[PDB]
Amino acid sequence: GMKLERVVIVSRHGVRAPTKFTPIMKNVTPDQWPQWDVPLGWLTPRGGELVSELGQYQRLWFTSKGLLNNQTCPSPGQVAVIADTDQRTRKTGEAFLAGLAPKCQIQVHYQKDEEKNDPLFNPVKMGKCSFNTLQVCNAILERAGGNIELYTQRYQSSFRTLENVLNFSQSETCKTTEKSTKCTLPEALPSELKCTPDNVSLPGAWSLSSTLTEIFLLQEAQGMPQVAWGRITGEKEWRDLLSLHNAQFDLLQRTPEVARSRATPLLDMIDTALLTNGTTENRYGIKLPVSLLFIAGHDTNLANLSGALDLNWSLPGQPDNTPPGGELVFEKWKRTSDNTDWVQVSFVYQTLRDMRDIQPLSLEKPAGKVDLKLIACEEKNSQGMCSLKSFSRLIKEIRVPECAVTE
Amino acid sequence: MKLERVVIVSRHGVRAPTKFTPIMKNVTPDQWPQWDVPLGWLTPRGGELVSELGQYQRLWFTSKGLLNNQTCPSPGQVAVIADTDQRTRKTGEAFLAGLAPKCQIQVHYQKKNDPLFNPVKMGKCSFNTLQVCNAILERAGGNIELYTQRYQSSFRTLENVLNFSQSETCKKCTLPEALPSELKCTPDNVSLPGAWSLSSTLTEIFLLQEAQGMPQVAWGRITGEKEWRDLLSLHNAQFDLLQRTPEVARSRATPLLDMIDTALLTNGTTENRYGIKLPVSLLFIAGHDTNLANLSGALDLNWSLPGQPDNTPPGGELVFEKWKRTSDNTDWVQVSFVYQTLRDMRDIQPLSLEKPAGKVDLKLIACEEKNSQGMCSLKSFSRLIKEIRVPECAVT
Ligand SMILES: [Cl-]
Ligand SMILES: [Cl-]
Ligand SMILES: [Cl-]
Ligand SMILES: [Cl-]
Ligand SMILES: [Cl-]
Ligand SMILES: [Cl-]
Ligand SMILES: [Cl-]
Ligand SMILES: [Cl-]
Ligand SMILES: [Cl-]
Ligand SMILES: [Cl-]
């Protein structure tokens, strides 16, 4: 019937320590933050272990569909891995192979100038690729309703939950302020968009909240004994908290005017990997095609791909829309009856509970999987898959030619 | 006329669909747009739309003297009850975000589970399955096929919106023919599995898509208010049979009827399940469309909402006002339905006394003593609830 011929996975790095630890973070709560023994922003051994569980699940799943032969190690030119220059992405590539193909010595490709940036993951740092600053800020602004304050009103109760979790009213930030209403984060730290030719940000209570709520998720996924000082009660409060993080990523990374430019190199790689019958990747030295191309990036990249392709989703049991180790999976299926090629898009992830418990993954106890819909495709299957040329042509429409990586 | 107490029973705000099934995929060749919150959960925008109703009510209740022109309400003036679902809890919070922003008023709920909103499902009482099914079948015109005949054009409009002809299900085909409907009554639930159940769910999905402000609503194939009305008549007709039929409605609405009664009649009691000290000036209750239908059926309240195709729309509020006549110190009850038009939901229209929310003036026919302007007497209102309530379904 339907045979799986090729897969491209764009994965967020696994569980990591917080990206920063600042005076503001310390002064928005009377409590002390739990410390992490790895440096800020690094993948933890537990983060690696959770990615290996996905690697293990994907080995079993790809083998059951015939993508990889049921042998000890995949054949030469079947599996290739690309990672961004950070330790977190590089060790996610390592960790994924430890699950997928342990003791096979498969290489993790990455740029060896480890000081500099890899444009596949961050093209707007190239000279050729810059944002039209007014167009981009205004586009994000109109997605927020015309003013950030209206976007803040939309998420009021979420900010109340974050404030309750931090015990914000009793922090140094609310020391001097006394009024009829509550001391609040948005009033203490008003948010306003900042757009430059190579970057977009929303500093204030919005950026801070995005960071803090992600830290709570990371604490939980890491298996830390005291998450958010024991003050998060059930999925409702988890999603109140992570709605702030998900909404900030929506504005800064899924807004088409930003996502199109930033997702272009990854879209070009995905397209090439699914289409060609013989090519040599020039920057890493990978002989495409391969049966499985695994790409280790960040949540920013998943959000850029989501916004560019117009993919919308929610992950059962996982409050972060772009969670640690979350995989956007592009599958090339061949219909046997006419040898026509079709593309299926999925999001493979672990629930927060399965991170917390380090749930062993298999075909019996599978990883979470959400079927994604590429609605803009012209030609579709009876089973919802985009045709190969419809998939490729959608990539042509959305891509920004100035943001291509021609090195 | 002095406004002294108010009870609001509200449907939760705009939410994602409650389910996503294979039949939903197979009745159209197109793909359904995905949502970015879990199935059945309130969207942030749904929360904002409810807060606009909270703002409107703050302005309206302040002008009428119920609440004081003040930053936050005084103790024991505003209380909130919500069902255990996230969508109702969030609706309570969103409502307070508009009524009393940053005042830290609590949303009460049981720590799907609360029998105030579902007394039959939780097992307080049960339906006599034959009596309920018979009452429904008589309202259907004898059977489900006869009811189908009364909504043929509506089914044709839905099939056109779905492009049903080119669907996996058809491979001349129609929804009622391809998916025959049959009534199912069990001790805790009634349903219409088949084309009726499906159509009731799909047409609500289109309304939620539109109210959510999605770019592609029903693949852009819902043309004119006439087609909106035709589509949601299927949704509304289901809720009429399955939720407004008195044999269903009176049982399911009993806990809410008792709460409304107690909130408007007492002089002082600490309510025993949520721990609310009644009376309050405003009691807000966050329920579902099924609850509004139950109350509507039990109280024999019929309404159509100008500009709003769903009779039990997102954020729709059944409002019970206790008015005092200062002439002879007589207490009177007034019933209204407050809501937002479908366009105002899509545009997120700021509400105020200048730009008011939709409002339908309702009248309780069955009460004995009545005002010149149709209000029931407080004593008669309590008597009416005593007559229509089903004691076995009390929570209490
Ligand atoms: Cl600290
Ligand atoms: Cl660790
Ligand atoms: Cl970039
Ligand atoms: Cl403040
Ligand atoms: Cl920032
Ligand atoms: Cl960001
Ligand atoms: Cl679909
Ligand atoms: Cl929203
Ligand atoms: Cl007051
Ligand atoms: Cl019930």
Author numbering:
A (entry chain B): 5 to 411
B (entry chain A): 6 to 116, 120 to 179, 186 to 410
Show the paper's wording.
We here use rational computation-based procedures to design stabilizing disulfide bridges in the phytase from Citrobacter braakii, a biotechnologically important enzyme currently used in RONOZYME HiPhos (DSM Nutritional Products, Basel, Switzerland). At its backbone is a mainly parallel β-sheet, surrounded by α-helices and loops. The second domain, primarily α-helical, is composed of two insertions (residues 39–46 and 136–259) in the first domain and is seen on the left of the Figure in red/yellow.
The structure with a disulfide bridge engineered between residues 141 and 199 was refined to 2.3 Å spacing with two independent protein monomers in the asymmetric unit. The engineered disulfide between residues 141 and 199 crosslinks an α-helix and a coiled loop of the α-helical domain and has well-defined electron density indicating a highly successful introduction of this new element into the phytase fold. The major domain on the right is composed of residues 6–28, 47–135 and 260–410 and is colored blue and grey. The rmsd in ∼380 equivalent Cα positions is 1.18 Å. The four disulfide bridges can be seen to be totally conserved. All the variants showed similar activity levels in the standard phytase assay and essentially identical pH profiles. Furthermore, very similar temperature dependencies of activity are observed at sub-denaturational temperatures while the high temperature activity drop associated with irreversible denaturation is shifted to higher temperatures as the number of disulfide bridges increases. These results suggest that, while the engineered crosslinks do enhance stability, they do not cause dramatic alterations in the native, functional structure of the enzyme, corroborated by the 3D-structure of one of the variants. Indeed, the effects of the engineered disulfides on thermal stability appear to be roughly additive; for instance adding the Tm enhancements (relative to wt) found for the single variants (2.2, 6.3 and 1.3°C for S1, S2 and S3, respectively), ΔTm values of 8.5, 7.6 and 9.8°C are predicted for D1, D2 and T, while the experimental Tm enhancements relative to wt for these variants are 9.8 (D1), 8.2 (D2) and 12.1°C (T).
